[PDB]
Symmetry: D3
Subunit: 257 residues, 6 copies
């Protein structure tokens, strides 16, 4: 019988591999994914929201930049509990959505990271408010390649990478949670959000300041983040606010006139 109280925040990195797919993928998301979703999890999800990603910045491709959105659920129970596999009504989820997102064409894994509802580490910019200004919120998840010691990767991240973020005045905030791997075997290890004022601030720090970094022995590309795009790193730059707070705001797929 018993079901564990397991409050978590999920993030899904929704890419769009081509502008010709955008109308169709966007349609599916807003016309189909929302109602199918709420139909299933309304009673045990407290917040379902989409954060459309800003235009892909220069060299964003190398950070597995999700060109469509982030998809953010707040769960009261583990959606991977086997008993939750049973649904009266099932979702409409065509093959085509996976083509559009880039799961299918070599093809890219579906990154679904589970987190505790609150950030575990606050490494810069504590006490910042909304009045302090509009944030270019760079959300990035990473997973160290196979056969790399996790403790060693953690040590690299926090002792080599983060200090560069702390040094940069262009970087207003740094936050990190460790991925709940015990839930869905997500290959990612960390999720970070790193705020800037704008795209140029992002570039200056995440490209130029980061050239200073020693290229690690396990690197899957020459430059930071040294991890395989869309496979061992995904990301998105998003705004402080979304109008797509789906549990509160959705009123059907109303069409423009």
């Amino acid at each position: 019988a018993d079901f564990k109280f397991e409050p978590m925040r999920s993030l899904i990195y929704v890419d769009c591999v081509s502008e010709d797919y955008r109308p169709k993928l966007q349609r599916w998301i807003y016309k189909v994914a929302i109602p199918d979703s709420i139909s299933q999890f309304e009673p045990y999800v407290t917040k379902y929201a989409f954060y459309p990603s800003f235009p892909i910045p220069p060299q964003g491709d190398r950070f597995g930049y999700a060109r469509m959105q982030l998809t953010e659920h707040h769960w009261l129970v583990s959606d991977l509990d086997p008993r939750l596999e049973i649904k009266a009504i099932a979702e409409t989820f065509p093959m085509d959505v996976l083509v559009w997102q880039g799961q299918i064409p070599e093809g890219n894994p579906f990154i679904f990271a589970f987190l505790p509802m609150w950030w575990e580490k606050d490494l810069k910019g504590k006490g910042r408010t909304i009045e302090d200004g509009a944030n270019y919120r760079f959300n990035m998840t990473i997973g160290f390649p196979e056969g790399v010691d996790k403790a060693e990767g953690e040590k690299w991240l926090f002792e080599k990478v983060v200090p560069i973020l702390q040094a940069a005045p262009e970087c207003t905030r740094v936050l990190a949670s460790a991925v709940k791997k015990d839930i869905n075997g997500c290959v990612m290890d960390w999720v970070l959000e790193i705020w800037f004022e704008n795209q140029s601030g992002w570039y200056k720090v995440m490209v130029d300041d980061m050239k200073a970094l020693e290229k690690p022995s396990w690197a899957q590309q020459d430059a930071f983040p040294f991890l395989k795009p869309y496979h061992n790193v995904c990301s998105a730059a998003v705004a402080d606010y979304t109008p797509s707070n789906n549990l509160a705001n959705y009123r059907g797929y109303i069409t423009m006139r």
Copy 2:
């Protein structure tokens, strides 16, 4: 102090024993029951909804057919925890509502069936993977409880080995789902809840009446024909649509009157 996280889906089988009562019972439900309810459980119920039952089909009376609605709560805690008996404001619940629902007559009355379930169906026995796009569903929700002194394991075995296969054989039946009732919560006499989908009333009839004549009449039967259980006492049911506009936590804006 401690309060156990106990996520459940409740169903109440709301009958209406006479069309002359319908205006008044419907009024109570939508004008009074909703605000009184939300006033009490808003902080620990995630979804409160009413699914109006379709017109009672031929021989529906024999399945304890609730002629008004199903009432569906999603709980985060056991509403039968004794500490939850204390309410600043109490509900308005007249005698008359029980007359209307058939709990009391003008000449024997009917129990109030309030079944607690896990939020997710336990058994998916037909039609897995069906979506809303596959078409409009005549959703026959039926709960049953085996008569007193009938072994539960034996009743389970009957249900799943004799009854369900007839549903599986029938092309008219698009879906079959079952959960075992949480009896430990409120001593509900029912044992199972099933939802059995059809295309329409005729599909329902063809299977639940005609195909079911084939069944061996069990020794404990309380009526001659399937479901072999006493209407409204050991079986209640309702046929409902996929969608309700009465999703009360989101949708309610007061008892606004027609012009």
Copy 3:
């Protein structure tokens, strides 16, 4: 350029000619008709709502009883202005909906009754000052149009001098209201819309069937008994509650499916 301020209340009498059609027609209405509709007229309709009809009462068939609902719009402009025919996105309206409503068979076929009215009742002939606290109302909404070649003044005189007094005499009848149909808008064949309240179905029957036998059968009668008009062609009706949860502009949150 100029667009006339034309505040009106529309009523559409939505029938359902068979229970096997109900799931599918209900689906279309709530899953498709609503969003397609709001997509088009949100900026110039102040209220869009559906009032599900109560179960068809005995002999309701003879009053063109809409077995599904009433569909009620409040317009700021004439939807029949020719310039309003152009829509970026058009509605999905299958042939099948007309089968289900009885506009076509799959056994003669019934017109689509869409009556335009002023937003306020023109005549208040009984029960003025009645409030919601006075009790739950069985609201019988009925529209009528006199057969071809019948003088309109003469029909009016019949209605108000012969019919209405029987309603006024009956204590079972709590309210009587009437507006004259705007015929100048969409050529609707109906002439009047009335709402006649009772306590319940039996009150309705006692008055609209039994008390009405007393009436002189007029020379133009299209059937033996009141209302003396051809069902679904020259009379449509529905009995509805004071309240609907389907106040679509405020309440709709998508076609969310039961679990």
Copy 4:
């Protein structure tokens, strides 16, 4: 047929003549007045809202200070068109509400002040261009009507030549706005509505009491001090905030009770 497009903003000055009445009057307003109201005018009112008045300031009694709220409707048509008198469902409006508001006593009562205005202020006499970021406003809304047999032109001249300049001189006063009352609608005795903003109650006092002592007492004065008009009869007022949570068409979700 034709109904004139008449966009207006109404204000009703809702007093509460005793603290012992506040619970009951407040209940009526929020439990009964809202749903009865929306039930009637939803299709032709674009905004219905209540602005609770701040605590009555010193000597506010002399300005006909409404100790409960302002009631603010935005109309698309004249509610005083005679055809709008007919309502299917009528409102619940007990005698007691009039006692509570002070229309009737337990020993002379007070008129019901219902002022119709154009939706936009006619005169902007101070503080043009002020935004919400400029700070929180103590908004003193005051309506006045000159006693019987006082020339209106002469009263206007007094107001704009003697009164207004004192407001303009006072740095404590951040804003001055005025519309002339639509008298042609409901024969409201009032002539002007003004809103006069301060930072706080003391600012209000300093200007509307102390600075105003400077004023010549006019020959028609109905009291010794400004505003020289009979409280609640020829002057009503209220001090309100920039924001109300009671924007009733958008926000109302029923009379949900505290736990």
Copy 5:
């Protein structure tokens, strides 16, 4: 990892120490506090609401009467779990709000911030069980108390329930009495009890909470001469509120829309 399921009802006693502050404090609450709040706790709070207090009644000052509102959260987890201190976006909460509420003087002794955690359901129902909304409009006097330092808690409880409550039960003017014990283990709130005591109106409140209560033995630990015998705003806070608020913030809020 694990986070405990801890369903609770919080109450915050929001005072306003001067009418000249009311516009500004009210603005902050409705323009800023709400969105900043929902931005943080939307996923684990089921109900966030404000109950504006009725006008301070005669001698209400002596009961630590919050002249602005009550602030009522329903939590699914302990907001005082240390891991909940981390927020992406932090709240805007100026010094000035503390001046307005009376936590600080503007340039000199202030008043503590009373934030009481409770179980979601009342623990004791001591009068008026079964009363409905149809029974009439309620003057709901919510009052929290905490016994002075070095007063035995069991002894204070015994005083409250054996001396005070019977006066409430005797008074026909008092329609309801409810009490929960404060969860002290959560945030070290100095208060011990929260009670709600209903009347018909302000005069009913006065007749009972002032006049009937004169009958009471003045305890040895008393911090003022008259009931409630506790230091205003420090060891007792209160508010009289209506059955209904329009500020049910999770459901109702549509932005800080300004009057025209």
Copy 6:
């Protein structure tokens, strides 16, 4: 007194001249513009919405492509009526917003294009009857105004006799719609607004760039290629989806920040 019933649809072409400005401009729009706006026009605007533009396509710069959104109001009265200039609270509109949108540099600046239209399209030139089920639309909304000293009738003739036929010839173009700009309202320099649908960006390109090379370059042309008009000055545009979540009158619940 009188206020004319003037139902209209406005469009504002909101550009964003640099990605470094997007966070800040987007913030202003969603945090400030919305509440300031609703605070002013809630009672006489039936729909306020934002349609975020898709990524600027190849050579979109030449069509005055608004890189932020379209801003769409539905008015019941002319916002340019002089009496509507008076507002109690005024809007917060920094210099910086004009920098971000490109009205000013920190080169050469760009006019603020605010086009008023009838609520319904005047000309339906292709794809009549198309529904939402027919598929997802790349909706290219484009407004144009003919250079100074060009006869308007002659420009109209060019548009409908030369340009539109190319759209009609292209199977890649699923829809063509046009309204004439109400110039009598706000002296907007634009003359027409068109919406031209494709399947996707490539369809847009193939037709609006490649097929359009076929066109005779007119004598008044302000650039070599179609649309032959000065970007952002005599032509603005945006490609948008069928649906926006930013339907501000229904959906806005404050500036809630991500966690």
